[PDB]
Amino acid sequence: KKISIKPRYKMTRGIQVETLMKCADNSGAKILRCIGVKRYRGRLNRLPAAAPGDICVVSVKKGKPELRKKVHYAILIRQKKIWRRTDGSHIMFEDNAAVLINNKGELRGAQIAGPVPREVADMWPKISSQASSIN
């Protein structure tokens, strides 16, 4: 069954296919690579690209030998490209990071390291309850 994704205002996208991201939960993985984005419909020659909140299709480049050589799902939580909010302010984070997910939407780990944007926290409430800081 398809995963529902709540509404979100327009943001500049920072992640593309071939970017290497860091894993932020204690599931066993270290480094992920983006191979696809969900909801991408296309345009001739344009690469699919994502912003925080989006779901990505990843491959595990470094981690436990159990997780390797397969295809997974992940949620994006931080990016280094600047984006604008609708009250007029701008914000950026220090790295690119994502977190692993089931086929129904549940987190695979139990802890999450680092801060999280306020946008990501209302789309995904179960990530809100495990974040050490919101903005």
């Binding site: 345009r43 001739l44 609708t86 009250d87 007029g88």
Partner: protein, 363 residues
């Protein structure tokens, strides 16, 4: 032959051919539909573009919907609109070939800025008024007035030569339209008597000029790869062998900008006068409507102005035509404005109100 990988075409054929405009004051293409169960009013106005600024706004949702109140920052445009003068009447009757215009009624004294527009800068080298009023009343399916601007009140344009136009009069009873405009000849009508806050509006003008431009910029086509001989900024194939001619739908190099455009559904935010303090905001300071240093490449605003949301066609100091909406409008969300930015637009201004700068440095 059959072409794998389809994509949309680059640019629109609605606006080909892309020639310069033949005039700086284009005339409106249509007018709204007359409802003769209202009082008599006008349907348009002419103003001048000054510059852009900020505003912060409270999105009224304070019901216990999950977002009570948001803040929203919006860009706006300011236009300077001195009052206009009426100096004539015009009627049109209906024939088998369409609208035929009847002889015109001039007032008593035509200004010196209306005579420079009609006969050039070197122009200085009765009951028949009453008979023509009877025709516009027996005949004359529709009625229009002749109005002119007063550019000498904005001394940063340097005109002395006025812009003139015809504007339709709406409101019922053709004999009532005429007698309302007979008691208005040679007098002024102000922009606060035409438009009101939170209404949708149309604009008509001419765009910023760019001259002769290449095809990567005029239409948005791809660049060629880096190894390519004979340049990379171009289209590679301009047609098939047959038909053995170039088609009107191929992209070519030529004039870009200075076109006539009509834009619709621009929302009005404020109506005031430049020689007083802008308020209705929820902060205390005085703050006239003009930033520290002035509007760049424009002076100050000292007459009436109007503020609308978003971008507006054209360049600074150029004339624009404002028209009432032709569509159906629902309501308009409730508008609550609580701050208007007036820092310097030259550089990165960090003060409002130069007295605030004076108290930071001391001396």
């Amino acid at each position: 032959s059959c072409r794998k990988f389809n994509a949309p075409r680059h640019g629109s054929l609605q606006f080909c051919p892309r020639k310069r405009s033949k005039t700086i004051r284009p005339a409106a293409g249509a007018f709204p539909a007359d409802d003769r169960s209202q009082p008599v009013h006008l349907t348009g106005f002419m103003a001048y573009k000054a510059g852009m600024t900020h505003v912060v706004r409270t999105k009224t949702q304070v019901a216990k919907n999950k977002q009570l109140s948001r803040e929203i920052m919006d860009a706006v445009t300011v236009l300077e609109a001195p009052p206009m003068v009426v100096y004539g009447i015009v009627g049109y009757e209906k024939t088998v070939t369409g609208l035929r215009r009847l002889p015109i009624v001039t007032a008593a004294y035509v200004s010196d800025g209306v005579l420079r527009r009609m006969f050039g800068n070197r122009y200085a080298s009765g009951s028949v008024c009453e008979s023509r009023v009877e025709m516009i009343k027996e005949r004359a399916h529709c009625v229009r007035v002749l109005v002119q601007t007063q550019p000498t009140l904005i001394k940063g344009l340097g005109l002395k030569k006025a812009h003139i136009a015809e504007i339709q009069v709406n409101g019922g009873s053709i004999s009532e339209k005429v007698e309302w405009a007979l008691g208005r000849l040679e007098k002024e009508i102000a922009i606060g008597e035409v438009f009101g806050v939170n209404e949708n509006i149309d604009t008509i003008g001419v765009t910023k000029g760019k001259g002769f431009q290449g095809t990567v910029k005029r239409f948005g086509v791809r660049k060629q790869p880096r190894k390519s001989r004979k340049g990379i900024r171009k289209v590679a194939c301009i047609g098939a062998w047959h038909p053995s001619r170039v088609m009107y739908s191929i992209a070519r190099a030529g004039q870009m900008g200075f076109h006539r455009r009509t834009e619709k559904n621009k929302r009005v935010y404020m109506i005031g006068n430049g020689s007083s303090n802008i308020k209705t905001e929820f902060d205390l300071t005085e703050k006239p409507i003009s930033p520290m240093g002035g509007f760049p490449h424009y002076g100050e605003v000292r007459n009436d102005f109007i503020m609308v949301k978003g971008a507006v066609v054209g360049a600074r100091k150029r004339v624009v035509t404002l028209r009432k909406s032709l569509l159906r409008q629902r309501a308009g969300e409730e508008l609550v404005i609580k701050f208007v930015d007036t820092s310097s637009k030259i550089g990165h201004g960090r003060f409002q109100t130069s007295a605030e700068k004076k108290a930071f440095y001391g001396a």
